[PDB]
């Protein structure tokens, strides 16, 4: 997904005037927030057992 | 020939079309050919 963001960032300035690229649907924050919940619950687990 | 779209005394571009894109402030020079 980050490579697609950088590819659109490469192809962005050569578009005609008045055309902008928008990102309505995305599952990158779902996966990112889920793996961040997992990392922080592992940190809470190791610190609370400590 | 143009019938509508340009006016009298405007300035159109012959040299340097690979370097430009509409909507940027740019240096002008009168071209040779």
From Swiss-Prot, chain A:
It comes from the Bacteria. The chain crosses the membrane at residues 38-50. Induction: By growth under severe iron limitation. Disruption phenotype: Disruption of MexA, MexB and OprM significantly reduces active efflux of N-(3-oxododecanoyl) homoserine lactone/3-oxo-C12-HSL/PAI-1, but not N-butyryl homoserine lactone/C4-HSL/PAI-2. It is found in: Cell inner membrane. Pyridopyrimidine derivatives, such as ABI-PP, are not exported by the MexAB-OprM efflux pump, bind tightly to a MexB hydrophobic pocket and so potentiate the activities of antibiotics such as erythromycin. Belongs to the resistance-nodulation-cell division (RND) (TC 2.A.6) family. The inner membrane transporter component of the MexAB-OprM efflux system that confers multidrug resistance. Functions as the major efflux pump for n-hexane and p-xylene efflux. Has been shown in one study to be involved in the active efflux of the autoinducer N-(3-oxododecanoyl) homoserine lactone, thereby playing an indirect role in quorum-sensing; but has been shown in another study not to be involved in efflux of this autoinducer. Over-expression of the pump increases antibiotic and solvent efflux capacities. Implicated in the secretion of the siderophore pyoverdine. Component of the MexAB-OprM multidrug efflux complex, composed of six MexA subunits forming a hexameric tube, binding to a MexB trimer, which interact with the trimeric OprM outer membrane channel protein. OprM is thought to not directly contact MexB; instead, MexA joins MexB and OprM by forming a funnel-like hexamer anchored to the inner membrane. MexA may initially form a hexameric ring complex with MexB prior to OprM, then OprM undergoes a conformational change as it contacts MexA, allowing the periplasmic gate to open. This is Multidrug resistance protein MexB. The chain holds residues 303 to 352 of 1046 of the full protein.
From Swiss-Prot, chain B:
It comes from the Bacteria. It is found in: Cell inner membrane. Disruption phenotype: Disruption of MexA, MexB and OprM significantly reduces active efflux of N-(3-oxododecanoyl) homoserine lactone/3-oxo-C12-HSL/PAI-1, but not N-butyryl homoserine lactone/C4-HSL/PAI-2. Induction: By growth under severe iron limitation. Component of the MexAB-OprM multidrug efflux complex, composed of six MexA subunits forming a hexameric tube, binding to a MexB trimer, which interact with the trimeric OprM outer membrane channel protein. OprM is thought to not directly contact MexB; instead, MexA joins MexB and OprM by forming a funnel-like hexamer anchored to the inner membrane. MexA may initially form a hexameric ring complex with MexB prior to OprM, then OprM undergoes a conformational change as it contacts MexA, allowing the periplasmic gate to open. In both X-ray crystal structures approximately the last 100 residues are not ordered. Belongs to the membrane fusion protein (MFP) (TC 8.A.1) family. The periplasmic linker component of the MexAB-OprM efflux system that confers multidrug resistance. Functions as the major efflux pump for n-hexane and p-xylene efflux. Has been shown in one study to be involved in the active efflux of the autoinducer N-(3-oxododecanoyl) homoserine lactone, thereby playing an indirect role in quorum-sensing; but has been shown in another study not to be involved in efflux of this autoinducer. Over-expression of the pump increases antibiotic and solvent efflux capacities. Implicated in the secretion of the siderophore pyoverdine. This is Multidrug resistance protein MexA. It comes from Pseudomonas aeruginosa (strain ATCC 15692 / DSM 22644 / CIP 104116 / JCM 14847 / LMG 12228 / 1C / PRS 101 / PAO1). The lineage of its organism: Bacteria, Pseudomonadati, Pseudomonadota, Gammaproteobacteria, Pseudomonadales.
